[PDB]
């Protein structure tokens, strides 16, 4: 199946230099062209370039030479770089593969993977719990604050629990960090009986926690 | 650069209903205008291509119309799971550029929260912390408030709150409000109520607890 994927810095000083790989499977990049879109939180799409089959590039005027593309065909790997970063350039940017009727529309995106352009240092989370009431549905959840920058993701129960799950939004802090909270009603039932562990993932700092979520 | 131009950032719709969302190009570009959708936390997802083709899988209540300047993406009869944002694009001539999106949201019946609060974890008190959260689960309309007590007296400017996008299957919304405390705060008050104001309740309902208790 076609996929495409991408990895990248988390943050970018300003004025620094962005360099992002998207691998492919599931097709050749030989015979397809892949292009980078991005997208500033909460906003819309802006198309930045695209790199042909066979190597040639075009990009957007508008980012004034500042980005390139290249690619390992053996390796199935696209590689977006772009120079002098500033705040305009904070955005989450995806690599997708275009339609072969080449139309510039774009049939398969990666998962996207968001910069954020900050003098700032990377912190991770911690993560605490949010324990069932002991006073029938109980919700339960994860707090998991004061990292940055964003995102983190969080399972329950390694993906095993989806259903009445909501992760909010994260809320940015006074102190520059971000906070989030992840919850999910269960059967009161349960809670003897059921483990409830949230896992958390933060790229940019490279974390991973896990919490056992307990009535206290 | 042609500019593609949605003429609503926000549609209202119910599920069952048609729905349709324009797009308009600033030059002519024939046929060739895509449209995506664009669901909470996800990429965009091609429907449509060249104006009016389907892409592979896509459900057959999505279609396109329009040539020129005016095209019109419509969804026959409206999904919850429909909820997201719809963009056009067009790839008539680079730069490929995309209208601004048009976000659907979808009315249904009032739905109260079930509301819980949670105390700080010892854990965090540790650090001189506290977070206390309150959850408002599963209600509609958006519209909600939420005020924190601290013995009995009303909070302002401590708290912060986030909502989550309407549900994929049953089209309410969730609420998170955390209040935050130094620790030597928290523990030097006893009740900690969330008290909550919405449609679906007649009067405002409180989960409290007493730390410690």
């Known amino acids: 199946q076609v996929q495409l994927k991408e990895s990248g810095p988390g943050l970018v000083a300003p004025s620094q230099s962005l360099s992002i790989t998207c691998t492919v499977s599931?097709?050749?990049?030989?015979?397809?062209?892949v292009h980078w879109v991005r997208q500033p939180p909460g906003k819309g799409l802006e198309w930045l370039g695209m790199?042909?089959?066979?190597?040639?590039?075009d990009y957007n005027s508008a980012l004034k030479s500042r980005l390139s593309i290249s690619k390992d065909n053996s390796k199935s790997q696209v590689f977006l770089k772009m120079n002098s970063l500033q705040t305009d350039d904070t955005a989450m940017y995806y690599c997708?593969?275009?339609?072969?009727?080449?139309?510039?529309?774009?049939?398969?995106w990666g998962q996207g993977t968001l910069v954020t352009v900050s003098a700032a240092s990377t912190k991770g989370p911690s993560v605490f719990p949010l324990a069932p009431s002991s006073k029938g549905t109980a919700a339960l959840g994860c707090l998991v604050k004061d990292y940055f920058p964003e995102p983190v993701t969080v399972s329950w129960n390694s993906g095993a629990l989806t259903s009445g799950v909501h992760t909010f939004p994260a809320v940015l802090q006074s102190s520059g960090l971000y906070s989030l909270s992840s919850v999910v009603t269960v059967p009161s039932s349960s809670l003897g009986t059921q483990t409830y562990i949230c896992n958390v993932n933060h790229k940019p700092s490279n974390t991973k926690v896990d919490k056992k979520v307990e009535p206290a | 650069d042609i500019v593609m131009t949605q003429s609503h950032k926000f549609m209202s719709t119910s599920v069952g209903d048609r729905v349709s969302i324009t797009c308009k190009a600033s030059?002519?570009?024939?046929?060739?205008v895509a449209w995506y959708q664009q669901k909470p936390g996800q990429s965009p997802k091609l429907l449509i291509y060249?104006?009016?083709y389907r892409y592979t899988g896509v459900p057959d209540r999505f279609t396109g119309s329009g040539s020129g300047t005016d095209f019109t993406f419509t969804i026959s009869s409206v999904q919850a799971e429909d909820l997201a944002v719809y963009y056009c694009?067009?790839?008539?001539?680079?730069?490929?550029?995309f209208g601004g999106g048009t976000k659907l949201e979808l009315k249904r019946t009032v739905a109260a929260p079930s509301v819980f609060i949670f105390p700080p974890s010892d854990e965090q008190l540790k650090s001189g912390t506290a977070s206390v959260v309150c959850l408002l689960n599963n209600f509609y309309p958006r519209e909600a408030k939420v005020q924190w007590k601290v013995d009995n007296a009303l909070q302002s400017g401590n708290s912060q709150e986030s909502v989550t996008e309407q549900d994929s299957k049953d089209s309410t919304y969730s609420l998170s409000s955390t209040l935050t405390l130094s620790k030597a705060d928290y523990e030097k008050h006893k009740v900690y109520a969330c008290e909550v104001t919405h449609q679906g309740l007649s009067s405002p309902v409180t989960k409290s607890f007493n730390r410690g208790e």
């Open positions: 790199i042909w089959g066979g190597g040639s590039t």
């Open positions: 997708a593969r275009s339609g072969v009727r080449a139309q510039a529309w774009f049939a398969y």
């Open positions: 060249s104006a009016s």
């Open positions: 694009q067009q790839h008539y001539s680079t730069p490929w550029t």
């Open positions: 030059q002519d570009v024939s046929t060739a």
């Open positions: 599931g097709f050749s990049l030989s015979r397809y062209s």
